[PDB]
């Protein structure tokens, strides 16, 4: 299907914090982020450890624990017909554009078990868990007026922040990776100049 492009900014601490809040409240009910720790999310998002424990750790876990959830994969697979996959790496499995289009493409479909279908993910087993915010979206997708807390722009911002947090979760090293790679490439150009000059000198 045709995806909607979203510009994900991994330096936006506020956007990533809002996305982490949305993930902890609306997504950790069924999805784990078990491959990342609350402590590292707090450190990378600029969230104080006490604030992270108070505001985003609902499972009773420690700050250094993986973002596990009570819903076991087998039970969830039985209940929904499909297991809610761990979302730590979903931004790498699907990409941020796919996630952005998917979380905004839920529409009402009575023939489906959960009363919804998805344009990006047809016959998906996800219930439309963000319906309270977006509102009632029906088929071209249109939101029924006065059915959600947020308007189209506000819900788009919410989904963008959530997808930004997911993108960070999939690749928590991206910013440090760029910072280190800049210096590595500078040193390698510096060393290349010397190696090339040495080769030129010897090959006379």
């Amino acid at each position: 299907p045709q995806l909607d492009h979203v510009d994900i900014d991994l330096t936006d601490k506020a956007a990533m914090q809002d996305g982490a809040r949305t993930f902890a409240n609306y997504c950790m009910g069924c999805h784990s982020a078990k491959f990342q720790r609350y402590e590292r999310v707090a450190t990378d998002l600029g969230i104080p450890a006490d604030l992270m424990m108070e505001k985003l750790v609902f499972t009773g876990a420690k700050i250094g624990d993986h973002m596990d959830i009570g819903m076991k994969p087998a039970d969830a697979k039985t209940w929904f017909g499909a297991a809610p996959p761990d979302l730590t790496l979903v931004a790498r499995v699907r990409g941020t554009d796919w996630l952005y289009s998917y979380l905004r493409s839920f529409y009402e479909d009575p023939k489906r078990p959960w009363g919804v279908n998805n344009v990006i993910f047809p016959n998906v087993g996800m219930p439309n868990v963000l319906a309270p915010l977006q509102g009632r979206q029906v088929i071209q997708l249109t939101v029924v007026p006065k059915t959600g807390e947020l308007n189209e722009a506000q819900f788009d911002e919410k989904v963008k922040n959530l997808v930004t947090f997911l993108a960070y979760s999939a690749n928590p090293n991206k910013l440090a990776s760029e910072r280190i790679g800049t210096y590595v490439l500078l040193y390698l150009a510096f060393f290349f100049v010397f190696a090339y000059l040495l080769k030129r000198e010897y090959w006379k």
């Binding site: 506020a14 914090q17 600029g46 992270m52 985003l56 609902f58």
Partner: peptide, 16 residues
């Protein structure tokens, strides 16, 4: 600022 940004969605009314 961050505390408001991270406020849990679920609000609970409590006696007193």
């Amino acid at each position: 600022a961050i505390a408001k940004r991270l406020e849990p969605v679920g609000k609970v009314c409590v006696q007193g």
